[PDB]
Amino acid sequence: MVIATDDLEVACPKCERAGEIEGTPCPACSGKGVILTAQGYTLLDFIQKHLNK
Amino acid sequence: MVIATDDLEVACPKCERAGEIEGTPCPACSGKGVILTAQGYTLLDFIQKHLNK
Amino acid sequence: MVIATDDLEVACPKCERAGEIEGTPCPACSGKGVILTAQGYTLLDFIQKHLNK
Amino acid sequence: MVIATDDLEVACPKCERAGEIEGTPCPACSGKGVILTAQGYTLLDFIQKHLNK
Amino acid sequence: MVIATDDLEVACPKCERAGEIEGTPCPACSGKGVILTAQGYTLLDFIQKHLNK
Amino acid sequence: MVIATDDLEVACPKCERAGEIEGTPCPACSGKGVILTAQGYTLLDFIQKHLNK
Amino acid sequence: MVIATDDLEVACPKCERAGEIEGTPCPACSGKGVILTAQGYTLLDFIQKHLNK
Amino acid sequence: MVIATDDLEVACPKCERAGEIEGTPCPACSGKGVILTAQGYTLLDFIQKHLNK
Amino acid sequence: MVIATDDLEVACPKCERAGEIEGTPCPACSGKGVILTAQGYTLLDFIQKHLNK
Amino acid sequence: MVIATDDLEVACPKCERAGEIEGTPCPACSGKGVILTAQGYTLLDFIQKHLNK
Amino acid sequence: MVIATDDLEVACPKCERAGEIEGTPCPACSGKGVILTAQGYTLLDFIQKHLNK
Amino acid sequence: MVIATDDLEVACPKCERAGEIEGTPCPACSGKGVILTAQGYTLLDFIQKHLNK
Amino acid sequence: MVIATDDLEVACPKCERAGEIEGTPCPACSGKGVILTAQGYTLLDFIQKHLNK
Amino acid sequence: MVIATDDLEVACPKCERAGEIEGTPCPACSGKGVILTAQGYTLLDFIQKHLNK
Amino acid sequence: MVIATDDLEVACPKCERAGEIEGTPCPACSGKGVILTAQGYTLLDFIQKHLNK
Amino acid sequence: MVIATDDLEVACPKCERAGEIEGTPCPACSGKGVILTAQGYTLLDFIQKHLNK
Amino acid sequence: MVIATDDLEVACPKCERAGEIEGTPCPACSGKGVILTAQGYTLLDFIQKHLNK
Amino acid sequence: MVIATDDLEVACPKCERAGEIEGTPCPACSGKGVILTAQGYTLLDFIQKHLNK
Amino acid sequence: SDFVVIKALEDGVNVIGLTRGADTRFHHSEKLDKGEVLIAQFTEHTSAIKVRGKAYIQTRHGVIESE
Amino acid sequence: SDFVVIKALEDGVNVIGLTRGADTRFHHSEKLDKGEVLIAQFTEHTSAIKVRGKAYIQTRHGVIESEGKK
Amino acid sequence: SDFVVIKALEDGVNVIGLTRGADTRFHHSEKLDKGEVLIAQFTEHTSAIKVRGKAYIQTRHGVIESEGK
Amino acid sequence: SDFVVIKALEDGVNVIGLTRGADTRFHHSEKLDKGEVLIAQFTEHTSAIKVRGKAYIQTRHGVIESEGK
Amino acid sequence: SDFVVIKALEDGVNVIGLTRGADTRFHHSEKLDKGEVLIAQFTEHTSAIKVRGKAYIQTRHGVIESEGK
Amino acid sequence: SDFVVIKALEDGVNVIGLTRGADTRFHHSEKLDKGEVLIAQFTEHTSAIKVRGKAYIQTRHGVIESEGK
Amino acid sequence: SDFVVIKALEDGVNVIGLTRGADTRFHHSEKLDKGEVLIAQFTEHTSAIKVRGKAYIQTRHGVIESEGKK
Amino acid sequence: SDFVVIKALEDGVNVIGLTRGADTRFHHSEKLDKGEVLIAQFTEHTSAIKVRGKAYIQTRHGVIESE
Amino acid sequence: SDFVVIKALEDGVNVIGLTRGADTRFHHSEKLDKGEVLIAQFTEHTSAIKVRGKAYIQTRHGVIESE
Amino acid sequence: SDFVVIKALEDGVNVIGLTRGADTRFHHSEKLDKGEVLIAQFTEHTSAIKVRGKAYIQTRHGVIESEGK
Amino acid sequence: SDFVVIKALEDGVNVIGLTRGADTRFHHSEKLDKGEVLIAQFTEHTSAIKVRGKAYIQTRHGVIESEGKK
Amino acid sequence: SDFVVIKALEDGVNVIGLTRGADTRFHHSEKLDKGEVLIAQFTEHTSAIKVRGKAYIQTRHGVIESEGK
């Protein structure tokens, strides 16, 4: 396949994919546990824009 | 275009794309008429995850 | 990366991406300012179909 | 140094550090704009307890 | 001959002279299929200005 | 001047530039009285194509 | 390139390219601000003649 | 987290964290129920010193 | 222990920790006798902000 | 003689002293056929200024 | 040099060298903005005593 | 070049090249602002004499 | 001065600078009384040419 | 002694300590005959400021 | 402090710092009770000289 | 050069070259702003004496 | 003698001390025939200022 | 001072500085009482020349 | 304002412009086939450039070859 | 303005943009696989860049080779 | 402002100007035949230049040759 | 504006940003493990950078190696 | 602002100024015969310069020789 | 803006920031233990930096070593 | 601003100023005879300079010798 | 804006800041003991710096050693 | 702002200032005799300088000798 | 702003300031005798400087000697 | 801005600040004894600096050794 | 702004400041005796500096030695 999950997201190095730091929500990823690649936004922004229009 | 619908979905061989088996909704595809490729999930899961966050 | 925003959206030649023609909403693009490519619909249709199922 | 301000306070994702939501004080952070980390309470509790005894 | 078609137009490398990208009108050439040389504009602008005056 | 009218048009040998043969419009030139050189078409085609676009 | 705009249009020495003489439209250029060269007419004549025939 | 409450305070072995011995306030901990580590004092002393100055 | 008094304060080289210069309060340290490390402020500011809130 | 015609004017290289380019008045020299040297203006300006005063 | 202004005058910590507290003259420094060092008085007293004797 | 404007015109010392003395036209230069040199008259007289004869 | 009147004109030997021969206007000088040097023409022709253009 | 007269003043090189140049008061030193060192001002300014306050 | 009062003055051995001898003012110190060191004069003379100039 | 303006004029220390003391003309310099040096008078006297005799 | 005429004036190289160029007053020196040295102005300005005051 | 009055003028030996010989004005000095040195003339001439120009 | 030189050493090289601003997406990808050369500036709209496929690249910092 | 060159020497290199401002979080993380090259400027939004995984890096200060375990 | 030098080493070299701004299209494509030379600046309108066909190229970064298809 | 390169030569290296302004505390500390590289500018918010643990560092002033333990 | 030197190595060399702005046409072409030299700046109006015919050219980037025929 | 590099060659090195302005006091004193490195700029608030204890120092003027007490 | 040095190696060299602006004409043409030297700046009015006839030329880009036939 | 490096080669070195402006006094003197190093900029308030005691000094103009 | 050095190698060298602006005339010509040296800037009024007669000239572009 | 250095190698050297502006006259002429040195800037008032008599001269362009009449 | 380095090679060196402006007087004179060093900038108030007595001086133009008698 | 170094090689050297502006006179002359050094800037008031007497001089243009007597 041309596009993999690794091409869209990357696990946050700070919270090791957890989203919380010993209870409190992670700063770096902002509670998402993953940080998105440019390819990821590209699609997400695209979809979010035109969906249900 | 790099990725086409054929790259994401394939017609369900059981229901021949119908989604119902003589009235009752198809088991294999689960009423979708189409089954998803690995590439399909990759996107769908990605999107489903990050949309409206 | 394999697919860019250029691959999904193309600026509407009529309204030069504005979405309005001297006040009134553009006919060609339908107030979108952008005409979606085949690749664009491929995904948008795909997602719209399977999301929250 | 071993402990930074980042380790004590985390910007509230709801009010993006503001403390108010379009005028009215933020619910999540409770008007603080920041959510205190476990390390934060550890010290604050400790101090509040033993100070001026 | 001093001036050839080659000296006025060049086929759009993106759409290979087609003017459409899998259905939707090409961005680069803007549905023209060709992009013009300086020599091309020189004449076109000249003509367009003085014709029917 | 690089390019003269002689470079674009040539008097039709059949109608000697008239455009009619004893009343009826000339076949060879097609009522134009002049036939066009390759250079002539090159320009005409070019202009016809891009004018008012 | 073999033919430039300079080869087609020459600024009118009377109105210094303005097209008006202290308000009133210029006599020499005839409100054009530019005097057309022989090469200019060559093409304009040619085109005007054969266009949309 | 680098530093935990266990790093600052330790439950008093005499009163098992109670702070009273059959009614009367504990001698060892001095009614605190917890005894402080060197690390605990370090902070407390530091803060007590510089706070509100 | 991870953080020592040394990591929070440093004795003022001017007044050798005294806080007065032959009677009058020291300029450098501003009567404090110690100047604080970044780590020191980090905690003091943190505490001072959130205590009794 | 101290000052020659060559010290006042120089034949225009573009129109070879003609002043017209295949009918239309020359751009470079501006219909003068000659371009003036600094020495030329010096005198011409001088004279034009003080003559008939 | 052996004695500097810093050795004679120290900025008053109360009024931050202003000499007034929100309008009214500062108590601590006594409107001086500066507190004189022992070295300062040494000289000032010395001089005041023996000058014009 | 052998003759310069400096050789033809000299600024009038009375009006510093103005031509007016606090409003009224200068006497010395006679409203000229410049006094013509012998070389100046040589030419001016010469020309005035023989022009359009 | 580089060029003097003597450089431009010379008294006509026929009319001794008069311009008339016993009443009738002089042939040789053509009523000018003075004959022109090469240098004289050079200027006169130059000026006559470019003046008021 | 720590501070000498040489550390406070220096004889003006221009007037060799006189204060007058052949009758008229010296420019360089401004009639003082001496120019003050930084150490000199330091004390003088200090004293002048706080004396009789 | 670099210079102390002891550096400037010394108690007069004759009057034991009194300034009077059984009523009448002291000869040795000249009613000052204190005698000046070289360092004392150096300053006093310096100041006395430059003050209010 | 052997004699400078500094050698002739000295700025008046009273009016710091102004010539007026808070409005009223300066006494010391006598409204001159400058006090003339011996060298100054030497020449001025000399000239005033012998000029126009 | 310390100051010579040479130290005050210099003959104008343009007019060789004359002050006129073939009749008309010289530009460079401005009819003065000499240009002044710094030393020259120094005195002239000094005198002109203070004379008859 | 570089130049003194003695450097400019010398008392006339004939009239011993008087300017008159038993009533009648002195011949040698010409009623001036003082005769001028070369240095004197140098200045006087210079000034007389350039003053008020 | 800086620029990069990119020569493709194979067919199908991509130069991708990443968007200037708070969000990072790719607004554009130019394709190069073996030997084509693109010269691209950083702009009000491109604050990062990604190269994929075998290519020879020249920057103000010197040469680097992508694979 | 100032930029960096990053060439991945293995699959799964991450170039992480750290946010300009008072707070420091990762707004973006681009993936590079072996051989891909990113050229990234410092911006109104990126004031620090973190690289993890084996990569060859060129900066205005000269070359440095990252060694990162992933 | 910066420029590039482009000398075509064959007929039919194209110098393509890509548009400055949010959108990236080719506003212009100049043709060069073998030996012709174009000197082009980056402008308010051109923020990228694409060369195709065999050509000798000079930039502020040094020389680079484009190869023919 | 200036920047520094920091390559960690061990696990658990810290790059600590000290706050620009009248007060000096640390607003942030980035962790680096053996081999990670951070490239950090001085900012409106960082006016000093502290490194602890074994690391290779490149500045405008040249290379310096921070020593751990 | 930049400029170029062009010396024609044959008769009939053309230096063509391409117009600055959204549109690209040629406002002017100067003719050079063998040996003539033109020195031309980039301007508010010229953002690209095209040379055709055998010519020796000097730019800020160094020498390049345009080839005719 | 200018910075300095400071590497401690022993425990307990102090980097002291002296206040910009009319008055000169120590607003801050950072401690470094053996091997730690501080990179500090001059700022709106720091116009002088004092180092005490054995340390290796890099400035725009070149390297200089502070010696221990 | 930027200037050129032009030394004529024969009689009748022409230095021709081409006008700055939309239109390109020759506002001026200075003659040089063998050995004379002109030093001319680019100006608000001259945006191109043409030399014809044998001449030695110095620019910011280095020397070039014009060969012009007249 | 310029600065100086000063390393004390003995105890009791003084770096003295002379005041910027019409009047020249010393607002401050920093003491250095053997080996301490001060790095001082010229400022809105210091327009001259005086060094006394044995010290090694680095300026934009090169090294000079005071005694 | 640029300037030129001109040393005359013979009597009667002329340095001629050509006027800045739309029109080009010579406002001034300075004469130099053998050995005199003129140092002239380009100005709000001189945008070109012409030298005639044997002279040694120094410009920002290097030496050239007129004949 | 630019200056020149002029050392007279004989008595009676003249440094002449030619006036900045439309008109060109000598506002000033300084005399130098053998060995004296003048250091003169170009100013709002001097846009050309003429030297006559044997003199050693230093400019930004290098050294040149004026010869005596 | 531009500064000077002055190291006294004897006792009683004087560094004298000459006032910026129309008038030229000595507003200040700092004493240096053998070995002391002054680093002084040109300022809004000092436009010339005079050194007298034996001293080693460093300027932007290079080193010069003053020899002054006192 | 520029400055010059002047070291007197004899007693009674004069450094003379010539006034900036339309008029040129000398507002000031500093005396130097053998070995004294003056360091003088060009100013809003001094646009030329004259040296007379034996002196060693350093400018931006290099060294020149003024000769007395």
Ligand SMILES: N[C@@H](Cc1c[nH]c2ccccc12)C(=O)O
């Ligand atoms: N949108 C991001 C893109 C970017 C530029 N440089 C980067 C470095 C790292 C990560 C992302 C980026 C920005 O403008 O800042």
Ligand SMILES: N[C@@H](Cc1c[nH]c2ccccc12)C(=O)O
């Ligand atoms: N948000 C921080 C990011 C940062 C830049 N440089 C740093 C150095 C260390 C720590 C964080 C940073 C800032 O812009 O200031």
Ligand SMILES: N[C@@H](Cc1c[nH]c2ccccc12)C(=O)O
């Ligand atoms: N329209 C884009 C063109 C561009 C510039 N640099 C690029 C790098 C890659 C891709 C496209 C571009 C822009 O100006 O930003």
Ligand SMILES: N[C@@H](Cc1c[nH]c2ccccc12)C(=O)O
């Ligand atoms: N908050 C301090 C941080 C700092 C910068 N440079 C320093 C040097 C020393 C001590 C602290 C600092 C400031 O902005 O100034």
Ligand SMILES: N[C@@H](Cc1c[nH]c2ccccc12)C(=O)O
């Ligand atoms: N009209 C175009 C001309 C141009 C400049 N540089 C270019 C590069 C390629 C193509 C065209 C151009 C512009 O101003 O941008």
Ligand SMILES: N[C@@H](Cc1c[nH]c2ccccc12)C(=O)O
């Ligand atoms: N507060 C002083 C600190 C200072 C800077 N440079 C100095 C030199 C010496 C002594 C103190 C200083 C100032 O900013 O000016």
Ligand SMILES: N[C@@H](Cc1c[nH]c2ccccc12)C(=O)O
């Ligand atoms: N008046 C013209 C003079 C000039 C300057 N440089 C030139 C070059 C060539 C021809 C004339 C000139 C101008 O200012 O532009």
Ligand SMILES: N[C@@H](Cc1c[nH]c2ccccc12)C(=O)O
């Ligand atoms: N009028 C044109 C002159 C010009 C300058 N450079 C050129 C290059 C080629 C052709 C003409 C020109 C312009 O200023 O733009």
Ligand SMILES: N[C@@H](Cc1c[nH]c2ccccc12)C(=O)O
């Ligand atoms: N007044 C003229 C003086 C001048 C400057 N450069 C020149 C060159 C030649 C002749 C005179 C001049 C001007 O300022 O422009």
Ligand SMILES: N[C@@H](Cc1c[nH]c2ccccc12)C(=O)O
């Ligand atoms: N207050 C003086 C201090 C000074 C600076 N540089 C000097 C040089 C010499 C003498 C004094 C100074 C000034 O600002 O000007």
Ligand SMILES: N[C@@H](Cc1c[nH]c2ccccc12)C(=O)O
């Ligand atoms: N007051 C004079 C001081 C001065 C500076 N440079 C000089 C040279 C010579 C004589 C005096 C000076 C001025 O500022 O202009």
Ligand SMILES: N[C@@H](Cc1c[nH]c2ccccc12)C(=O)O
């Ligand atoms: N008053 C003149 C002094 C001057 C400066 N440079 C010169 C050169 C020559 C003659 C005088 C001067 C001026 O400001 O211009």
Ligand SMILES: [Zn+2]
């Ligand atoms: Zn996280």
Ligand SMILES: [Zn+2]
């Ligand atoms: Zn199914």
Ligand SMILES: [Zn+2]
């Ligand atoms: Zn549309």
Ligand SMILES: [Zn+2]
């Ligand atoms: Zn919140």
